[PDB]
């Protein structure tokens, strides 16, 4: 619920070590947490907030050029000058090119001409700055259990619905206590501060589409920066970069704009972040979070109830969804009240006894009537199996066959485990919980190799990454000691891998 067929969803099976589980929440997917007991909570992280902001510089895309009134002097009555340079809103380049007797020296040669253009802009970047305080990552909680996929309707934004629960966690108030009526209060403690390394990311405006970029990138743009303090009379530093004075070889000088540089700036943004803004925030997609999810306070809700009665009519053909579960949604007819929902995956029927480990524990229907409306999920075994609730006369049975083998789930799972190591990595070891001398020593080594690596090979586009990959490969086929060849080939191989994993 709230995450099904959502793809990047990762379910964590069992917190372990005393109701403590830490998880990394990235917008590109979900995390559905299932314990030995307690409802199966489905966490999905949506959006991000940008708060107060601030402006840093600006950049002009488009240059109006007017005036250009020129001044020339004799071969010797110094170099040229005219009143318009003290204006500082103009741009002038004194180039010594002209000739004698034409204009008038009686002194063949040289000449100095100042050419001053009026520089006013039109479209301009603001380039605002982000600081980690005050941005809260909105996060949505969705517990499974009894649910249609709407039908209850009322969402749980404000509450009612009582199945889900919005949490907004900000570095000035982490520990977002979330109250799920009748299940339990799921508290979770997240660090907004340290996840994305903000303060290295300027929030960047163009016309409408907004982006995020490095200060390291954003200070290096060759545009007539502004200082962004205030307007009233914008004072353009540079102006030299965006206008070009082309002197003709035979005689004279021309002022020529470089025209709107707008699109070129789009090209230079390859690999930004796609961003959405509003007046007081600017919805930030992407991102990732780290949170220790505290399962201490929860209850399976109505563990204690009857088994209902006769129904089992199911609405749809379970639908073999991606990665794992066949997500079932029945309508036991005629039930009296808040009674349990029996479900089991049977290897063979025959003597009942399923091994299925369904991920939707203690499912519970609601009130009387008949509209019912309960949706479940069951993880069957890869082989053929029978989906069965085993109540009443002749119940209703279903025949289902999963595909793929434990080997396939093995390779598949490490495939993504690698991508967790690839993007956001060095926090990937935070996906597992209650670690010591396995997951911490691990995250430690990976963090040192990560910092060195990023420091060593920063400045790496995808193509570059592949090249240096192959060079380190070719060294890995040569030299000596089986060390620098093996260390070298190793680190080369990991770039190649991080490249392909970036692309996929």
């Amino acid at each position, epitope marked *: 619920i709230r995450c099904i067929g959502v793809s990047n969803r990762d379910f964590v099976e069992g917190m372990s070590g005393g109701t403590w589980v830490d998880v990394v929440l990235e917008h590109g997917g979900c995390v559905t947490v299932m314990a030995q007991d307690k409802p199966t909570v489905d966490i999905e992280l949506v959006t991000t907030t940008v*708060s*107060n902001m*601030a*402006e840093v510089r600006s950049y002009c895309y488009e240059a109006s050029i007017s005036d250009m009134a020129s001044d020339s002097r004799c071969p010797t009555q110094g170099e040229a000058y005219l009143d318009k340079q003290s204006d500082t809103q103009y741009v002038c380049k004194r180039t010594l090119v002209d000739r004698g007797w034409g204009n008038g020296c009686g002194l063949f040669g040289k000449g100095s001409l100042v050419t001053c253009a009026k520089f006013a802009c039109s479209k301009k970047m603001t380039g605002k700055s982000i600081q980690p305080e005050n941005l809260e990552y909105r996060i949505m909680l969705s517990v499974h259990g009894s649910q249609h996929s709407g039908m209850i309707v009322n969402d749980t934004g404000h509450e009612t619905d009582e199945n889900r629960a919005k949490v907004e966690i900000t570095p000035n108030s982490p520990r977002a206590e979330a109250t799920l009526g009748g299940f339990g209060s799921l508290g979770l403690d997240c660090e907004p501060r340290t996840g994305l390394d903000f303060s290295d990311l300027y929030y960047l405006t163009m016309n409408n589409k907004h982006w995020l970029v490095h200060k390291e990138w954003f200070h290096d743009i060759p545009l007539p920066w502004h200082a962004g*303090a*205030d307007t009233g009379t914008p004072h353009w530093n540079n102006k030299e970069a965006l206008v070009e004075f082309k002197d003709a070889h035979a005689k004279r000088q021309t002022v020529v704009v470089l025209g709107s540089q707008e699109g070129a700036v789009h090209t230079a943004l390859a690999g930004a972040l796609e961003a959405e803004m509003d007046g*007081a925030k600017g919805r930030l997609s992407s991102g990732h979070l780290k949170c220790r999810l505290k399962m201490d306070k929860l209850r399976l809700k109505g563990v204690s109830y009857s088994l209902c009665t006769a129904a089992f009519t199911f609405t749809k053909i379970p639908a073999e969804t991606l990665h794992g579960t066949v997500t079932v949604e029945v309508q036991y007819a005629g039930t009296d009240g808040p009674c349990k929902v029996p479900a089991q995956m049977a290897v063979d029927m025959q003597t009942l006894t399923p091994v299925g480990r369904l991920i939707t524990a203690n499912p519970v229907i609601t009130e009387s009537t008949e509209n019912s409306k309960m949706m479940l999920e069951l993880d069957p075994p890869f082989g053929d199996s029978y989906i069965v609730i085993g109540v009443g006369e002749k119940k209703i049975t279903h025949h289902w066959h999963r595909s793929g083998s434990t080997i396939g789930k093995a390779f598949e799972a490490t495939v993504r485990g690698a991508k967790r190591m690839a993007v956001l990595g060095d926090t990937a070891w935070d996906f597992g919980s209650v670690g010591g001398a396995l997951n911490s020593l691990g995250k430690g080594i990976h963090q040192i190799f990560g910092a060195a690596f990023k420091s060593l090979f920063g400045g790496m586009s995808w193509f570059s990454q592949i090249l240096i990959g192959t060079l380190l490969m070719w060294l890995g086929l040569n030299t000596k000691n089986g060390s620098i060849s093996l260390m070298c080939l190793a680190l080369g191989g990991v770039l190649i891998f991080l490249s392909t994993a970036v692309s996929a």
Partner: antibody
Amino acid sequence: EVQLVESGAEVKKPGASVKVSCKASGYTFTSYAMHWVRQAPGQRLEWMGWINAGNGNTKYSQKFQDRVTITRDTSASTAYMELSSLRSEDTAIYYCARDKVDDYGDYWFPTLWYFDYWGQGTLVTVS
Amino acid sequence: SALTQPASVSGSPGQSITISCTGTSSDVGGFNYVSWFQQHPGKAPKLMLYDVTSRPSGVSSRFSGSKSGNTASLTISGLQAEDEADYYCSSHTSRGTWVFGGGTKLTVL
């Protein structure tokens, strides 16, 4: 306690020159500093001040940039704001208030509070 | 360049009022310099805030300051009858000069 008192002036016709005194009482001179905030009734307070009584330094609002000049006298513990070439509009009341200097004696960035006390006022009117 | 402050306000005793002082990034936004001056008309102004959230020792504790972006909010609760002092917001600009807001005449009922 902290006491600020001032001289109750009169009109001194358009084009004249007011001199108002602020003699600080009840606290330590040498840490007093000083401000001048003009107000008449019915509009917004303008701050035409200066900020340094240890060294005798001054900073004026850009409106008044050259009109007022200010003398400090530590013997009388008194700061004298003098507004030359006053006009019909500057009919107002001039309060002197303090924002204590940093100990270095140089005043650049104020205390987080500014004005913990105020002169008691001097209404000045122009004919 | 005077800070924007609205002309005036009223209401039942005990009731919270909000006075909004809006500046620019030059002063109120990029600084925590604020203060709200209670000015009893005909008497000398006094300073009922300092450092925003903070208050001088002799302040009635039910005054509360706040800021986000460019704002200065003086939020008072359970207004006691004699709380009409013309409220002026003032701050230290970046250029090193102080500006007093347009002032809020406070209207008690």
